[PDB]
Amino acid sequence: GTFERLLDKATSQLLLETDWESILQICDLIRQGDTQAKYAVNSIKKKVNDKNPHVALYALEVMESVVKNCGQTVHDEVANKQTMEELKDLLKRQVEVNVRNKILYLIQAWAHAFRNEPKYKVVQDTYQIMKVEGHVFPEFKESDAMFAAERAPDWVDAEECHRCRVQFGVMTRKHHCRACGQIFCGKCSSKYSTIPKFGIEKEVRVCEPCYEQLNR
Ligand SMILES: [Zn+2]
Numbered sequence: 001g002t003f004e005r006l007l008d009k010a011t012s013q014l015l016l017e018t019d020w021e022s023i024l025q026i027c028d029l030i031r032q033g034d035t036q037a038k039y040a041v042n043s044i045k046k047k048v049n050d051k052n053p054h055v056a057l058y059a060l061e062v063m064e065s066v067v068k069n070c071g072q073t074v075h076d077e078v079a080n081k082q083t084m085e086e087l088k089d090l091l092k093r094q095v096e097v098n099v100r101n102k103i104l105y106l107i108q109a110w111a112h113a114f115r116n117e118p119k120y121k122v123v124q125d126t127y128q129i130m131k132v133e134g135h136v137f138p139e140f141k142e143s144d145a146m147f148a149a150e151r152a153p154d155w156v157d158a159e160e161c162h163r164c165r166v167q168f169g170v171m172t173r174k175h176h177c178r179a180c181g182q183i184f185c186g187k188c189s190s191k192y193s194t195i196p197k198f199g200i201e202k203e204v205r206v207c208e209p210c211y212e213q214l215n216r
């Protein structure tokens, strides 16, 4: 029950300012895998759509933080067509300027944050649409779009290659994919890539599926 208690606490109409303690605990729960991102983001979205603009604004601040801090598992839940449509709709019916302004702030911030990720293009597409419709965005600060690097996965040991199942031995050395942490023979891990999301800016060994996910 902790995620839910905290979300309630963070979006209380009693608050005079952002409850950073509760927000950062919510971020930690998602990063640690204690709370699933889809459920978390769905729960926050329910609050974003509240008729009370204080609740909606506080919920948008929770959304801002989970996106900034929680990595791809959360980005997958916001940088999609369903969410962009819901925010376009919300922005169109919202009569409260601070909620409106925050939606614009976030769309702009995310569109810049996601500029290297083709799977997330719908956010930049939505930004451009909104500008054509006449929305005046707040001035952009680089700081808005600077997200926390994610933690690279721990490496797995095993007796055989994760892909081809060859047995490791003297003539078949163990290697690891830096992107997923699984264990491979050399034949199955002969690709090299940067991994920006983990702050890896040198080309490091990856498996073939990770290589293709990374080099779209
Ligand atoms: Zn192999």
Ligand SMILES: [Zn+2]
Pocket (backbone or CB within 6 Å): 177, 178, 179, 180, 181, 182, 206, 207, 208, 209, 210, 211
């Ligand atoms: Zn991999």
